[PDB]
Amino acid sequence: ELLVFNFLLILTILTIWLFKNHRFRFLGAMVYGLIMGLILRYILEKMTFDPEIFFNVLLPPIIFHAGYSLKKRHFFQNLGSILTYAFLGTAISCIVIGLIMYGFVKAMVFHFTDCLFFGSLMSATDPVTVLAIFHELHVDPDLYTLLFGESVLNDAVAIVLTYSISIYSPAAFFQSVGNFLGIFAGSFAMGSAYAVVTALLTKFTKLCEFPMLETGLFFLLSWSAFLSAEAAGLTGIVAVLFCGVTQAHYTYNNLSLDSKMRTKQLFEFMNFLAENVIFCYMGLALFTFQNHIFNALFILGAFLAIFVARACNIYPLSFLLNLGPWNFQHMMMFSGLRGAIAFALAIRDTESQPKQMMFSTTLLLVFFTVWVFGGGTTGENLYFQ
Amino acid sequence: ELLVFNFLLILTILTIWLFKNHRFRFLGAMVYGLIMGLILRYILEKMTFDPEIFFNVLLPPIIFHAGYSLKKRHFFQNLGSILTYAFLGTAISCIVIGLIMYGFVKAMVFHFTDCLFFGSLMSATDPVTVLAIFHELHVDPDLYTLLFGESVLNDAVAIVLTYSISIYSAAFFQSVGNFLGIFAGSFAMGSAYAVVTALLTKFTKLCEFPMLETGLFFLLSWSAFLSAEAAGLTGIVAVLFCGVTQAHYTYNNLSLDSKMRTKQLFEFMNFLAENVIFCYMGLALFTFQNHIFNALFILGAFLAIFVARACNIYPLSFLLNLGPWNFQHMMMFSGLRGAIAFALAIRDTESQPKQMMFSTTLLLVFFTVWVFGGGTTGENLYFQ
């Protein structure tokens, strides 16, 4: 694994250079999915040293900046809608299984347990490209906050919800519900406890006179909450650190006054390496030869179902919210990408079932298809408002 | 392994507490490492998993800040004096081998090639505690910049030199060329990436994109370390140290925004050097197969400790007087032993079943020298 890491960096200068050079083009690392892969089709196994378990420990730093960048402009404005969109994860899962179940059934003119697994897997929605486009336009703040809040909550629900399905074993349905509620409640309680401990430590003790000591303690205490989840056996490790929203609510504002900018720059740099996760999408598309061995003709069943499922649970959910404004226009815009986190779930143990491989293959084509919406976003923005 | 890192953080949290309490204490974090091991001793192998190759990849962030923190106030006034201490690593190894050679021969009442490894390894000296004292007191700026000079340079020299004599087996001539060739190639390739970084930020306008140039600087600097290892050029730690020219040119050209961020970001990882400071007791209490020897050869090495830092600086610095120094800084150079020398002793730590004595001996050296470092303010007032 000597020069394997070098290839990750070497291509990344090109990714950095693409953003600066192609700043005004019609339309960064996602472009290399087609051209770059074929040249190396002939080190392939080593470029695959990528360990799934270690993929779920470099993601929490990505999640932390998402929860550390809240502007507190939606806690009393659109928080209720976001909490209403917590049921969207259940809504997407129960509707995706509605159509995809008939998909492979009509293929033969195998169990239902993995059908639920795919539905909960696809529920993640992280339109980072759309959010970046909205931010640079510095417009529609109401849509900016509401969409961003929905994007960081469903994936947190998705990771917790899919685990209970994987351990479903009959009745025993309430056992899976208890595991879902227990893990999610435990993740929030213990995860926020470390943030509270960090907040109270810097609220009374006059440690703010040492900018590095508070900076180092802040990173260690925040990372300890994520680490403690695996030690105690409580799963949802991604959701544990995501609950550090209260960390930016109390610890940031209490007495820092110097590391306020330092915390962002140190942590956004970790989030600035999100192209590595972006690069990993195409990496498993060709390097992991066995992963995409099937590429079966089940795409059309998932292609039609993945958009109609989102279509049939955005307006009805917003219709209920409208009973108790919203411009009646934002629901069309809502339908963005299909989740950055989503890829990691499809690579869980990678061969548990014969169809476990083809879920990743279907997900790979999703990333190669839905990303055109990110490019066709400026035109869509001016189309409506 | 999931909960192994968790126990490292809690003891690392207490390090911040110790440095918080010590504003006026007579005086270090070196205490909790010993205390933590006793609790677990009275989980063992899992705590000290610590892959040997993985120690050399968490080390470069420590070296990078040292080369990036230069005040550019020494290359014009004491550059020659500091470069004269490039032979100090060899000069220390010239006399350390002599005493250690008689240490086991007289005790016996292996071969001398192992003495070379111990002498080259011992030449490292990074008295980070000494620099912290001078900075807080804000005194002796000439002494502060001179001490920082050889302290960080010889660490790279020790790592590159010990490899040549480790494979050395007349045959001594090409070992020097191997040592010189790697060191020469480290400066070329190591500064090659720095030149590329410098020219990119001076011609193309990256000043308007501060969110992007910070990643570019980190990626290019890191790639210098990765390229050296992959290409087969050893002394990869020295290769990243050859990026000292980034602070000379890249840091000053057109950043104007990330100047502070680049310093803080890399210095933040250097603040995580307590893990290196804490990996001693992790291996000094839990690795029962490693440190169980603790042979009665410490006195032979301990006598070599003081004379190594005396038989060289007093003669060599006398030569520099030919072309003041007040004769107080002359004796002050006998500082600490640093923290980089640990990794050279753990190079798979299994060359021979009985030769692992050097790993045992080095661990006691850190404890013995640390208490000497604690009583540094007393020597500061006695001399100056």
Residue numbers in the entry:
A (entry chain B): 23 to 49, 54 to 68, 123 to 189, 199 to 259, 269 to 422, 428 to 488
B (entry chain A): 23 to 49, 54 to 68, 123 to 189, 199 to 258, 269 to 422, 428 to 488
The authors write:
Surprisingly, there was no obvious density for any of the 90‐residue long C‐terminal tail regulatory domain (CTD), likely a result of its predicted dynamics and intrinsic disorder. We repeated cryo‐EM structural determination for a horse NHE9 construct lacking the entire CTD domain (NHE9 ΔCTD), which displayed similar kinetics as the close‐to‐full‐length NHE9* construct. Consistent with removal of the entire flexible CTD, 36% of the auto‐picked particles now contributed to the final 3D class with an improved EM map resolution of 3.2 Å (and EV2B and EV3). After several rounds of refinement with global and local search using ctf refine and polishing, a final resolution of 3.19 Å was achieved at gold‐standard FSC (0.143), with a local resolution range of 3.1–4.1 Å. As model building revealed only minor differences between NHE9* and NHE9 ΔCTD structures, the later was used for all subsequent analysis due to its moderately better resolution. Superimposition of NHE9* (wheat) and NHE9 ΔCTD (core transport domains (blue), dimerization domains (orange), linker helices (grey)) structures, which show only small differences in the most mobile regions. Cryo‐EM density map of the NHE9 ΔCTD homodimer with the 6‐TM core transport domains (coloured in blue), the dimer domain (coloured in orange) and the linker helix (coloured in grey). In NhaA, with 12 TMs, the dimerization interface is instead formed by interactions between an antiparallel β‐hairpin extension in a loop domain that buries a total surface area of only ~ 700 Å2 (Lee et al, 2014). In NHE9, the substrate‐binding cavity is located between the dimer and core ion‐transport domains and is open towards the intracellular side. In NHE9, the end of TM3 was observed to have moved away from the dimerization interface, exposing a hydrophobic pocket for lipids between the protomers, reminiscent of lipid binding in PaNhaP at active pH and the more distantly related citrate transporter CitS (Wohlert et al, 2014; Xu et al, 2020; Fig EV4A).
